[PDB]
Amino acid sequence: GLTEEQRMMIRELMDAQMKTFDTTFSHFKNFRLPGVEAAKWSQVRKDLCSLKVSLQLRGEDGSVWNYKPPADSGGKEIFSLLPHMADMSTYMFKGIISFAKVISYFRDLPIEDQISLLKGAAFELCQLRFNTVFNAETGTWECGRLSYCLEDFQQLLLEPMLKFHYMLKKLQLHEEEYVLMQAISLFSPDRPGVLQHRVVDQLQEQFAITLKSYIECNRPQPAHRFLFLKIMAMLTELRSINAQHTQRLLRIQDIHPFATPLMQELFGITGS
């Protein structure tokens, strides 16, 4: 029940996803691993312990390395996973940038708006891709040979990022619905610095109409009533999480620098 333009739109998004999402993380390599003002620190300590994961690395030979993080003992040990997480997020950001550049509607925007949209949406598209490898039964992001497992229930769901991942996963979305969510987030007309507000706003409305129509054509079941509105509400929540997490990053960076060059670009840090 989709128009020709709508089916072409979904095809181009699925094509871009297929070419730029390394779903087995086969090409994520050479990453760092953990080794073998007072009111600012209190806040940064609160920021960093809201996400506690162990790390597992499965070797191509069948060997397994497992890392269990330290407890907070009021010292620098809270930063032990930051270099690794910077490398993983940088890796994800490159895939996201490649995704945008493959899409015709994005290529056709002026380069300054391309940049402003990527700065605005890179984190959100990263989270959307990570949700597709999240295992909600085991609390683990399964990234090929790497796994990130939440450390020991309804308590962890208090953290908005974690509640987001569990709630989005339980909607049991199709690949097409995920990539349309990525498009709607990418083409957000109200990101800081956007000039072609009207063009971006019209593109976003078309991706949202395509998603609403896709759901109406392919999901008649009572469990999926209001699915389109649930997704849109999740995208609003993701924007709030984006703003919250950007402020945590800048606080951590202020007292303990760790952002990679690509992270600095996307998040406004100039090097001075």
Ligand X SMILES: C[C@]12CC[C@@H]3c4ccc(O)cc4CC[C@H]3[C@@H]1CC[C@@H]2O
Ligand Y SMILES: ClC1=C(Cl)[C@]2(Cl)[C@@H]3C[C@@H](Cl)[C@@H](Cl)[C@@H]3[C@@]1(Cl)C2(Cl)Cl
Give residues in contact with ligand Y (CB under 6 A): 51, 53, 85, 88-89, 92, 126-127, 130, 141, 148, 161
Q: Was 191 annotated as part of a binding site?
A: no
**CA–CA distance from 4 to each of 104, 142, 193, 219 (Å)?**
16, 36, 33, 19
Binding site partner of 53, from ligand X, ligand Y, none, Cβ cut-off 5-8 A by kind? ligand Y
Q: Which two tokens stand for residue 129?
A: 């891709």
Report, in Å, the least distance between residue 226 CB and ligand Y: 27
Residue 175 touches which of ligand Y, ligand X, none (CB < 5 to 8 A by kind)? none
What is the rounded distance in angstroms from the CA atom of residue 215 to the CA atom of residue 212?
5
In angstroms, the CA 80 to CA 70 distance is 8
- Tell me whether residue 130 is annotated as binding: yes
Nearest to 84 by CA among 23, 143, 158: 143
Tokens, residue 115: 């940049």
Is 107 marked as binding a ligand? no
Please check whether residue 258 is in contact with residue 79, taking contact to mean a CB–CB distance below 8 angstroms.
yes
Quote the tokens at residue 211.
């998603």
Residue 141 interaction partner, one of ligand X, ligand Y, none, beta carbon < 5-8 Å per kind:
ligand Y
CB nearer to ligand Y: pick between 56 and 196 = 56
Q: Which alpha helices (DSSP H) does the chain contain, by range?
A: 4-20, 38-49, 82-102, 104-107, 111-131, 160-170, 175-186, 197-218, 227-255, 261-267
Q: How far is the CB of 69 from ligand Y (least distance, A)?
A: 11
- Per partner kind, with CB cut-offs from 5 to 8 A, the member of ligand Y, ligand X, none near residue 249 is ligand X
Nearer to ligand X, 183 or 259 (CB): 259
Length of the chain in terms of residues written = 272
Q: Which is nearer to ligand Y, 126 or 234 (CB)?
A: 126
Distance CA 201, CA 105 (A): 12
| 10 vs 92, beta carbon nearer ligand Y | 92
Least Å distance between CB 192 and ligand X?
17
Q: Whose Cβ is closer to ligand Y: residue 16's or residue 53's?
A: 53
Interacting residues toward ligand X by CB under 6 A: 47-48, 50-51, 82, 85-86, 89, 123, 245, 248-249, 263
Q: Are 203 and 187 in contact (CB under 8 A)?
A: yes
Q: Is 256 annotated among the ligand-binding residues?
A: no
Closer to ligand X by Cβ: residue 10 or 55: 55
Q: Cβ of residue 149: shortest distance to ligand Y, in angstroms?
A: 9
Residue 197 assigned as binding residue: no
User: Annotated binding residue at 11?
Assistant: no
CA gap 162, 48 in Å, rounded: 14
Binding-site positions for hyperforin read: 89, 127-130, 245
Binding-site positions read: 89, 127-130, 245
